[PDB]
Amino acid sequence: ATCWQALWAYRSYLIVFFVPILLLPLPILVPSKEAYCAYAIILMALFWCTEALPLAVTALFPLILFPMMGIVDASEVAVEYLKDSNLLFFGGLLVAIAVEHWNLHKRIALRVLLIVGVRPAPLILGFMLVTAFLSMWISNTATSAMMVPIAHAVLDQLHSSQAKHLHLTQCMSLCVCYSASIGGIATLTGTAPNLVLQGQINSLFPQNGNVVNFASWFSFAFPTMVILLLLAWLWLQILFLGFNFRKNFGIGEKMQEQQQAAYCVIQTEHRLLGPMTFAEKAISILFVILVLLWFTREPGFFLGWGNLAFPNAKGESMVSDGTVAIFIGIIMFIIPSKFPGLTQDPENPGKLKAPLGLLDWKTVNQKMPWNIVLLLGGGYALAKGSERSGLSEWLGNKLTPLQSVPAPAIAIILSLLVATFTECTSNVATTTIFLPILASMAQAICLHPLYVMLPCTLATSLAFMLPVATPPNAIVFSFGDLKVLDMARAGFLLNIIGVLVIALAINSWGIPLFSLHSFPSWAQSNTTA
Amino acid sequence: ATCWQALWAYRSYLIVFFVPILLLPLPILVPSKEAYCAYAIILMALFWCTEALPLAVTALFPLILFPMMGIVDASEVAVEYLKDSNLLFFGGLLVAIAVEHWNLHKRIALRVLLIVGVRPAPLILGFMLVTAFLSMWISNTATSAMMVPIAHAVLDQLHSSQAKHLHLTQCMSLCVCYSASIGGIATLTGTAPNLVLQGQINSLFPQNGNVVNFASWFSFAFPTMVILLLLAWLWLQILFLGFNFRKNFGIGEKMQEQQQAAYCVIQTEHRLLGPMTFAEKAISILFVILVLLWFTREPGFFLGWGNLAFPNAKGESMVSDGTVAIFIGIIMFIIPSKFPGLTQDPENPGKLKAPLGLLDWKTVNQKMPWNIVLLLGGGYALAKGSERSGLSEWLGNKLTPLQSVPAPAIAIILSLLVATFTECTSNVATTTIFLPILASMAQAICLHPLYVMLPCTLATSLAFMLPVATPPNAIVFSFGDLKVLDMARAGFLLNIIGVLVIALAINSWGIPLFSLHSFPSWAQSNTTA
Ligand SMILES: CCCCCCCCCCCCCCCCCC(=O)OC[C@H](COP(=O)(O)O)OC(=O)CCCCCCCCCCCCCCCCC
Ligand SMILES: CCCCCCCCCCCCCCCCCC(=O)OC[C@H](COP(=O)(O)O)OC(=O)CCCCCCCCCCCCCCCCC
Ligand SMILES: CC(C)CCC[C@@H](C)[C@H]1CC[C@H]2[C@@H]3CC=C4C[C@@H](OC(=O)CCC(=O)O)CC[C@]4(C)[C@H]3CC[C@]12C
Ligand SMILES: CC(C)CCC[C@@H](C)[C@H]1CC[C@H]2[C@@H]3CC=C4C[C@@H](OC(=O)CCC(=O)O)CC[C@]4(C)[C@H]3CC[C@]12C
Ligand code: NA
Ligand code: NA
């Protein structure tokens, strides 16, 4: 009896000791570098899902596993842990720390609740719609980095105004996370695999006639985005709240009048705030300026300030979104938090004292999620180890004996495999590798390309199970009120739903506007006929 | 009156606003990329010395300055902020956090004080000798990362046993910092520019006869190290303590018997500790194993375990010192801090609870100096911007019209310039660039190489003014009780002392054992005669 409670109390130590031993037949029986990288991937996924170690400690495992298995040496694996996206997260969290420190987050959360109201499922739908609209035009990482702290502030105000809590918290966190990545598929400039697909079409089949452009991508990918967003909202609401759809929408007495009480509490808390202080006004202006600079830097469909000022030899911007975030975060240290804020010096009773800035270093040190910086870096290191061991090439060359399958099932199997492989590795390198293989495979069996290239492009964006794929999937672990098992349990079904929605969009309304029953003349080579 | 105290209270804001404006004639009047990188260097040095901003905030300035001046784009400047040396610092600080959390640091500090005694100048000399002996054989960063927390613990125990304090603290911090870099010059494998010099001699002048080897480097560079260490001890003791040399050595009554009181207090505090706990024994064993693995990984003069296991195609180690540090730090999370430590669960009154590890994440998050990680990264970014703008090449090509100078003054001017340029940039890239220029310059004027190549190699190691050069110079800012102006004030004279000691060693006992009055036959080309 107690000898089983001793083993159940020690379960993390038993997992950490026994899971690496049980996977040893994969590197022992198959002596290859692809097998070693697969060992590292499966081990890190199991350690993240069981939470046997902290997240940031599991994230440091490529630093010891990749040099001593021979994939890549220590100096080359160490420069993967701070890229530009990781710095964009750091810079956005500086602004969020400043917003919370001067009580602007309470004012924003109370205005949001006074506009939308206190009803769980419509409030979640409103956050999902705003996040998806923002990630059509700016980066997915920046959208996540400004939308996650706002949703956390709104949830805290809603839970204090009514005095379940944890399940509504998990639902709103995952809804913002998934909306930031779902909304990026709708525009051609919304996420990087879309531009990789346009470049590979123009490179592999010249004289295609610019068949993939802004309007033809929007006409195909906007209804897919809207259908997938509504299905994601419905499934997350079912999984975390009940099957009721009546207390979810707050309908009926014993719900209608216990919401007027919380709404009156919210009105009282909003009235109890005074006028805006100097720090709140300065941070509001800087926040608006940061979002406006993110819209106009490199919009893709017209020419931004990052193309006019600061171009490279190809006309692209040398300045990125992380640069603008670090710029605003640095400016916050040099602006005084109160302008005639001259305090008499207590340890020097003849001098005055200047006020602190909108940010000081000890607040930033206490409030920054350093473990998420390490988690994002560990994901990047896993992806580079996957592309340097030859595992991505080995997984790409498995899609070639998929030829002996009828055509609507080829795309479904392909989308399943591409979403699953993207859960381990990156998504831009997979789109770089997989598209020539698929283009040759479709040229072999007299099938139109973009019948297999479009589902492969759309499937790299819809991966929802692990924090290693797509930096939004890491950013929701910042406030520490969500487990990885919640994300995997919600994301496993959402991958399958995304696969089915892609199949509906490619077998209906994708066939007319791309002429997918034709085998066009710009795809003919000397091998076809 | 008060209108001057308002301006004096606001002096950091005035510095931050006015220093970038006053330096604008350098990029405006000289429109070049070398001038832009020099602007960034001078601006960051002024912001660090005035402490107008926090150290880690000034360290983030290459991320905004280098893409928007056109030196290097955002994605390439962002991957400079986490290299292997920065990770070695992180991994060593994990072990130091574990040592302090379980009160092993108090036991170590009390044993050190019971052995050495309570006398300031001999205790400082003992720390300097141990640090210099350790950095002859292992990395300078690892030596600094384990010696700085121990010295801090010893200073805290000494100041509590006597109840000035701050000046003795600054003296011991700078002494450990400077000893870690001074001791690395004595062996051929002690620091990386020495091996760069041996490789460049073997590459530029083949059939030299292996004139630079282990024994001939040790015979030249060991007395230089000992003389420079004694002069550094004397100068730091003069600058931070008094000119007395009698209260510094604790000699004479009113000092002799107020030290027996503190020594008896130290004996009482050591006796009041009990036996060692389980956590203290586990951390002591892991600390000894980590130091023994650092000695034997790649010793240079024999074959280590990193050459036998884990070699690359050239036989070098794919595993580094940072890998071993991260390995030990990861192991500390999985070892229980008490073995039958089964606590009855308070929030679940039918189950037990396993103990926490030797490290948990919230302790690491509260205690890690994240700002020093950012400071080391900002230094690496400054160095890469210096080598990509062409500023290092431009500073190298200035040493060529030094030909019209008598020979003992060429080496002195050269060592001054090389130490000053190393204060801004790195030291391995400067040794890579400057040695062919100096070798051709010495072939032009019938002068022996290694009369100019040896002072250039030795001068890149002795730079003591800024945290950007040599990662030990950043690691002493971890405990926040030292300003950059203290380091600059102490290091400015120590650079000149190092230059004079190098001149003494190259004009005495370097002339016999390298035959520096000969112009040998392996340096002749078709241009000489
Ligand atoms: C589509 C539904 C969306 C529901 C809302 C979910 C997303 C909310 C995102 C909020 C983003 C805030 C950005 C930061 C603003 C900085 C400026 C600032 O703080 O100034 C002080 C400002 C005013 O403070 P005050 O002076 O104390 O009132 O605070 C604010 O937070 C700005 C005002 C709130 C804006 C909410 C907009 C919501 C989106 C549209 C909702 C449409 C609902 C449709 C149904 C309506 C029925 C009537
Ligand atoms: C040359 C002068 C050097 C002066 C000392 C400055 C540098 C001190 C570095 C200390 C490094 C400690 C490494 C970590 C040890 C882990 C093991 C551990 O904690 O085990 C428990 C161990 C014993 O604890 P206990 O059981 O409570 O006594 O604690 C220790 O800290 C180890 C014992 C102290 C070692 C000090 C050695 C100092 C270097 C040689 C000094 C020579 C002085 C010449 C004049 C002598 C006059 C009589
Ligand atoms: C949490 C910390 C304590 C690490 C936990 C241990 C395991 C997760 C790792 C660390 C070291 C790894 C080993 C490092 C090196 C090797 C040798 C490697 O040997 C080969 O087959 C290479 C053959 C060749 O190079 O010719 C096989 C995998 C293995 C055993 C690895 C298996 C997985 C190990 C034991
Ligand atoms: C602390 C934060 C608010 C930054 C503080 C401002 C300055 C430290 C920096 C930031 C932007 C910098 C500018 C960025 C770009 C340029 C354009 C650059 O233009 C050229 O001469 C390039 C000519 C060419 O490319 O042909 C000259 C330097 C300058 C003014 C830089 C001068 C120094 C500035 C003003
Ligand atoms: Na986007
Ligand atoms: Na060394």
Author numbering:
A (entry chain B), B (entry chain A): 2 to 164, 213 to 578
The publication says:
The solute carrier 13 (SLC13) family comprises electrogenic sodium ion–coupled anion cotransporters, segregating into sodium ion–sulfate cotransporters (NaSs) and sodium ion–di- and–tricarboxylate cotransporters (NaDCs). NaS1 and NaDC1 regulate sulfate homeostasis and oxidative metabolism, respectively. From an overall view, both the NaDC1 and NaS1 form a homodimer, and each protomer consists of 11 TMDs. The rest TMDs form the core domain that is responsible for substrate recognition and conformational change to complete the transport cycle.
In addition, we elucidated NaDC1’s outward-facing conformation, encompassing apo, citrate-bound, and N-(p-amylcinnamoyl) anthranilic acid (ACA) inhibitor–bound states. In this section, we will predominantly focus on the detailed structural analysis of the apo structure of NaDC1. Notably, the intracellular loop (residue 165 to 212 amino acids) of NaDC1 that connects the HPin and TM5 was poorly resolved because of its flexibility. In addition, the rest sequences of NaDC1 were clearly resolved, especially the preTM1 region (residue 1 to 12 amino acids) and intracellular loop 8 to 9 (IL8–9; residue 383 to 409 amino acids), of which the counterpart has not been resolved in human NaCT structure. The two hairpin segments (HPin and HPout), loop 5 (L5) between TM5a and TM5b, and L10 between TM10a and TM10b are essential for the coordination of substrate and sodium ions. Notably, the Ile550Val mutation occurred as a natural variant during the cloning of NaDC1 from a cDNA library, which was subsequently used to determine the protein’s structures. The polyalkylated tail of the lipid was firmly lodged within the hydrophobic pocket formed by HPin and TM4c, with additional stabilization facilitated through electrostatic interactions involving alkaline residues Arg112, His319, and Arg108. For illustrative purposes, we modeled a phosphatidic acid at this site; however, the precise phospholipid species necessitates further elucidation. In contrast to cholesterol binding to NaS1 C half (HPout and TM9c), phospholipid (modeled as phosphatidic acid) binds to the N half of NaDC1 (HPin and TM4c), which marginally propels the core domain toward the extracellular side. Although cholesteryl hemisuccinate, one of the cholesterol derivatives, was added during protein purification of NaDC1, the phospholipid site is still occupied by endogenous phospholipid-like molecule, indicating a higher affinity toward phospholipid molecules in this site of NaDC1.
